[PDB]
Design an enzyme around this catalytic site. Structure first.
Site, PDB file in Angstrom:
ATOM      1  N   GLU A 184      47.833  50.344  29.132  1.00 32.42           N
ATOM      2  CA  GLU A 184      49.061  49.829  29.657  1.00 32.42           C
ATOM      3  C   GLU A 184      49.638  50.723  30.713  1.00 32.42           C
ATOM      4  O   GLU A 184      49.557  51.913  30.634  1.00 32.42           O
ATOM      5  CB  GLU A 184      50.070  49.664  28.480  1.00 32.42           C
ATOM      6  CG  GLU A 184      51.384  49.060  28.775  1.00 32.42           C
ATOM      7  CD  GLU A 184      52.126  48.701  27.469  1.00 32.42           C
ATOM      8  OE1 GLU A 184      53.354  48.682  27.525  1.00 32.42           O
ATOM      9  OE2 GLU A 184      51.480  48.416  26.434  1.00 32.42           O
TER      10      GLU A 184
ATOM     11  N   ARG B 232      52.279  51.942  14.699  1.00 36.87           N
ATOM     12  CA  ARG B 232      53.561  52.626  14.912  1.00 36.87           C
ATOM     13  C   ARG B 232      53.550  54.038  14.386  1.00 36.87           C
ATOM     14  O   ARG B 232      52.797  54.331  13.453  1.00 36.87           O
ATOM     15  CB  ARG B 232      54.688  51.854  14.252  1.00 36.87           C
ATOM     16  CG  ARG B 232      54.785  50.441  14.787  1.00 36.87           C
ATOM     17  CD  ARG B 232      55.825  49.581  14.036  1.00 36.87           C
ATOM     18  NE  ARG B 232      55.686  48.174  14.493  1.00 36.87           N
ATOM     19  CZ  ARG B 232      54.817  47.297  13.985  1.00 36.87           C
ATOM     20  NH1 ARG B 232      54.006  47.620  13.001  1.00 36.87           N
ATOM     21  NH2 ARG B 232      54.741  46.071  14.506  1.00 36.87           N
TER      22      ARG B 232
END
Length: 391
Positions: free
Chosen positions: A134, A274
């Site tokens: 990303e 996470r």
């Protein structure tokens, strides 16, 4: 039509800004819903649409019908689909710290888990076997975390809170990658009185430490008062991107989006591992196994773009997508690529032209350019962003 203005989806996730897309782009929001993400792409949960005839169709279905023509042969044979999703991201609050496993481990993870079958459970890490490189490109000043600090930096920031947890003292005694890994895991695994102690020491330090990253911890504590991720700005670089700056999010590296508006370009994967700033169960062993405990110096965090004519390319070290900004002027410039492209008006006004077709984009609007329709001519004022593939 050669150039297809996009009808795009806005995800109303509860964390999104009620005002950012309206203030930037004039997108309507009369009932003041949170507008978290504006999606440009062909994601099956909510594909962008194009207008044929008069009817709209899913961009995903349209690509499906016509892969080589729409994607180009290279993308069609490598990926079999549009290989990226392009977003405007607009949180009203700090978001979770995340790590993207690399391609091999995502494959291993996706298989390890199927063999014990359950998709939408909280034990599950891998929704698919893809990696998730990303890029983020700041539209407004954008506060983030990315990568571990130089060890000497961590040592300095941890001194004031040495008393919070024995893992901190242990790292301070020998500040190396092994003990950084133990610290990172120890912090995320804190419980009950161990956790309240550590958080009490940290919140007391805020009163005697000034500036960053202490200020960032205060910002985060507004939303995550009881999260062991409050210690993360002491381990990870805090970066304030100015508009126009970008950062590539490498694999195996914790990062977070904390405040502001950005464009986000990502490969296609729904995997989200996470690493704090979340109420959800975290599988810490799995997380640690997918983290590279190597410092990244601050000077290396931003992508250095390269300007050639009217084009500012942001070099991306994977094949899944490429990203460039294009200056607009009165005299047209030709924007071409071997792949599908999405073009997005960042500011000003863009007039696209292909043969006899003209298409105006105002800020915040975008068009899809199929591979067979490259190149298009662009004029106007301001800047156009482009997502594409360089293969």
């Amino acid at each position: 039509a050669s150039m297809q203005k996009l009808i795009n989806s806005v995800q109303n996730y509860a964390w999104g800004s009620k005002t950012a897309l309206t203030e930037l782009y004039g997108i309507a929001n009369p009932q003041q819903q949170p507008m978290a993400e504006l999606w440009m792409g062909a994601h099956p949960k909510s594909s962008s649409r194009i207008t044929t005839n008069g009817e709209t169709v899913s961009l995903r279905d349209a690509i499906e019908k016509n892969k080589t023509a729409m994607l180009g042969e290279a993308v069609a044979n490598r990926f079999g689909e549009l290989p990226f999703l392009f977003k405007v991201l607009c949180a009203a609050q700090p978001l979770s710290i995340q790590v993207a496993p690399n391609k091999r481990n995502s494959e291993i993870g996706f298989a390890k888990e199927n063999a014990a079958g359950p998709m939408d459970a909280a034990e599950r890490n891998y929704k698919d076997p893809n990696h998730k490189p990303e890029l983020v490109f700041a539209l407004t000043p954008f506060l983030a975390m990315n990568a571990f600090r130089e060890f000497s930096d961590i040592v300095s920031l941890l001194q004031p809170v040495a008393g919070a947890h024995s893992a901190i003292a242990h790292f301070l005694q020998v500040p190396n990658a092994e003990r950084l890994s133990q610290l990172f895991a120890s912090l995320l695994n804190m419980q009950g009185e161990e956790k309240s102690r550590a958080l009490a020491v940290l919140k007391a330090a805020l009163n005697s430490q000034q500036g960053e990253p202490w200020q960032t911890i205060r910002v985060i504590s507004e939303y995550y008062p009881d999260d062991s991720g409050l210690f993360s700005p002491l381990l990870l670089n805090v970066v304030k991107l100015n508009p126009g700056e970008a950062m590539f999010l490498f694999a195996e590296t914790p990062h977070a989006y904390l405040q502001g508006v950005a464009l986000e370009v990502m490969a296609n994967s729904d995997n989200v591992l996470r690493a704090g700033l979340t109420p959800k169960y975290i599988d810490i062993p799995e997380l640690v196994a997918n983290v590279k405990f190597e410092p990244k110096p601050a000077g290396e965090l931003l992508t250095a773009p390269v300007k050639s004519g009217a084009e500012l390319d942001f070099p991306i070290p994977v094949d899944d997508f490429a990203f460039s900004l294009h200056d607009l002027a009165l005299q047209e410039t030709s924007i071409g690529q071997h792949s599908a492209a999405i073009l997005f008006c960042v500011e000003g006004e863009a007039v696209l032209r292909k043969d006899e077709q003209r298409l105006v984009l105002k800020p915040g609007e975008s068009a899809f350019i199929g591979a067979d329709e490259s190149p298009v001519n662009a004029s106007g004022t301001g800047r156009l962003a482009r997502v594409y593939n360089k293969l």
